[PDB]
Design a binder for this molecule. Structure first.
Ligand SMILES: [Zn+2]
Lengths: 201, 140
């Protein structure tokens, strides 16, 4: 591919959890861009998230300019990586932005590849928030942590709602709207979100 | 998906012809149908649903009906498109109850000659679009 030797060494060390090699790579190295991604491969941070490595993921999170954080958060939520989820949520990006609460589809102009998958799409549906995914996987710890940060599953409107937002979504690509409603209800109907959501569940 | 559908047709035909290994060929045809259904299942947008339902006119739906691929046509991802096309140019009637639909049928029956006579101006009229819908054809 278009990859070079140094960045490939970085990627394999991160994927296989070579902590000292990654630490040497990120110290006093002008080259070896942190967010370098193959044409059809995963980011280094995504590789570190896929195979549980808290130290490697946090060392990557040291760097301020680094993308695909949301995709790795979704990947960690899809599994039991509670510590990795906690480390990712500690990034200043989530703290000082509305990324966590709002869905990737309508969070912003989505200029950056925050939730982007390998090349074009997303790991999950564009209307699946991290909290909705956590409810889907019934991860009680992850659901509790996401709720403690202020992220909640917004209740979908009535099926006959005629507001501007609902009409705008229904006018074009109504199947995605129906699938998003079903996903939101599946998140709401999950036992984890039901038990940890509100008083008197 | 088209290759799998034609292969399902071929496997069903060979299951009928052989009659010795009919179970094996039927199992292979079921495998092809399951692959088609699974490919349809992963849709997440209306564009992908349309792309699977017809190539570059529900061509793939018609071709699956011809091959008796029951699960591909009865899948909700295809039913959502078939209902939108079926209730074309009249969307408010979809959510009405069965009694309202029967009332609409009776109203059409009472005034069928009148709307037939007025169909001459229908192409230039607003109501012609309603009368040309795939549902009002069935009601008529
Ligand atoms: Zn609404």
């Amino acid at each position: 591919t278009s990859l070079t030797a140094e960045e490939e060494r970085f990627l394999d060390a991160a994927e296989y959890g070579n902590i000292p090699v990654v630490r040497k790579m990120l110290e006093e190295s002008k080259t070896l861009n942190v967010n370098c991604v193959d044409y059809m491969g995963q980011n280094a941070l995504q590789l570190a998230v896929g195979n549980e490595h808290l130290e490697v993921t946090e060392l990557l999170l040291k760097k301020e300019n680094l993308a695909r954080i949301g995709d790795a958060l979704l990947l960690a939520i899809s599994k039991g990586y509670v510590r990795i989820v906690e480390a990712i949520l500690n990034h200043p990006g989530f703290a000082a932005s509305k990324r966590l609460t709002l869905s990737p589809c309508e969070q912003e102009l989505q200029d950056d590849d925050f939730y982007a998958y390998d090349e074009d799409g997303t790991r999950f549906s564009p209307d699946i928030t991290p909290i909705i995914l956590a409810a889907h996987c019934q991860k009680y710890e992850v659901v509790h942590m996401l709720l403690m940060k202020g992220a909640r599953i917004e209740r979908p409107h009535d099926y006959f709602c005629k507001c501007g937002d609902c009409m705008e979504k229904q006018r074009h690509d109504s199947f995605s709207h129906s699938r998003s409603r079903i996903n939101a209800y599946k998140g709401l109907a999950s036992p984890a979100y039901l038990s940890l959501s509100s008083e008197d569940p | 998906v088209l290759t799998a559908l034609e292969l399902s047709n071929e496997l069903a035909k060979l299951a009928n012809i052989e009659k010795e290994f009919k179970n094996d060929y039927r199992k292979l045809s079921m495998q092809c149908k399951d692959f088609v259904v699974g490919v349809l299942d992963l849709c997440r947008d209306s564009e992908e649903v349309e792309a699977i339902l017809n190539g570059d006119s529900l061509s793939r739906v018609k071709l699956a009906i011809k091959y008796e691929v029951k699960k591909f046509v009865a899948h909700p991802n295809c039913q959502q498109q078939l209902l939108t096309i079926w209730y074309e140019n009249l969307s408010g009637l979809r959510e009405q109850t069965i009694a309202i639909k029967c009332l609409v049928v009776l109203v059409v029956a009472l005034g069928l000659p009148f709307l037939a006579i007025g169909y001459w101006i229908a192409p230039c009229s607003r109501l012609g679009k309603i009368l040309r819908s795939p549902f009002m054809k069935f009601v008529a």
